[PDB]
Symmetry: C2
Subunit: 153 residues, 2 copies
């Protein structure tokens, strides 16, 4: 099957970004239903928060714009910064209001498992959940659910 | 073991870039000797070429600056463009002379296997080769070989 080339990944066209939390949205770029893995541009136009969760596997990121981090580490990432998260580490992603929106290229190995404050597992978000959310949004905004399927490898 | 945070990944400080071919160099960001996998910033300040090779596994890229591509595909990538290469596909990477240097964030699963024109396998470049090259360079330019070891996960 073919390579993928997606020009202007962190596009200014808002239709391509699928709401994930109230303050954070994602543009899918590449999705592997068999590997439970995907690549996306994560976007927060203002202050943003993704609730605590862990990944059984690794996460890689390259910061395109803005200012973000995880509360469980001591740094904050701005344009040009690289991040790797170790498997199994629980983390809470935050985005700060900056001149530019937070835009981050992420390569994610799922599932995410949502954690309450006690550190107990309360829900999950896996590649099928991601596909379903992206197809539903893309159909609604007029891009078509079939566009999401074109991303699959 | 810890997360990795590398600020200013595609740095202007030339010491961090390790010569790979005559025209192309790489800054290691993250290296997994056990997974035969690494992440880097690939840099070409002028015209550049990486000889034909294939990867038994996948490659992901996010274009930071410049203009580059693989001769075996019909596109060329510029700032902001995402690329995925399918496992087992033989490809020849080129960089064009542009206002900015070619800078690309790559997540590579090794080995690379070098190909002659007949499509026969003539050499290889694996994670141990990469570590050895990076340690040798970093020692020479004064960053220290031990810095490379700090990248390992
Ligand atoms: Fe996460
Ligand atoms: Fe390659």
């Amino acid at each position: 099957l073919p390579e993928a080339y997606i020009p202007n990944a962190a596009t200014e066209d808002e239709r391509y970004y699928v709401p994930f939390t109230e303050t954070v949205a994602s543009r899918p770029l590449w999705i592997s239903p068999q590997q439970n893995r995907w690549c996306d541009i994560l976007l927060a136009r203002e202050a943003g928060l993704v609730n605590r969760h862990y990944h059984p596997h690794e996460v890689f990121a390259y910061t395109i714009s803005g200012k973000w981090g995880y509360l469980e580490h001591d740094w904050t990432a701005t344009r040009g910064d690289f991040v790797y998260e170790t498997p199994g580490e629980g983390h809470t992603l935050v985005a700060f209001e900056h001149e530019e929106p937070m835009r981050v290229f992420f390569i994610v190995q799922g599932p995410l498992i949502w954690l309450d404050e006690a550190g107990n597992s309360i829900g999950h978000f896996d590649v099928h959940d991601y596909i379903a959310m992206c197809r539903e949004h893309y159909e609604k905004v007029g891009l078509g659910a079939d566009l999401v399927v074109t991303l699959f490898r």
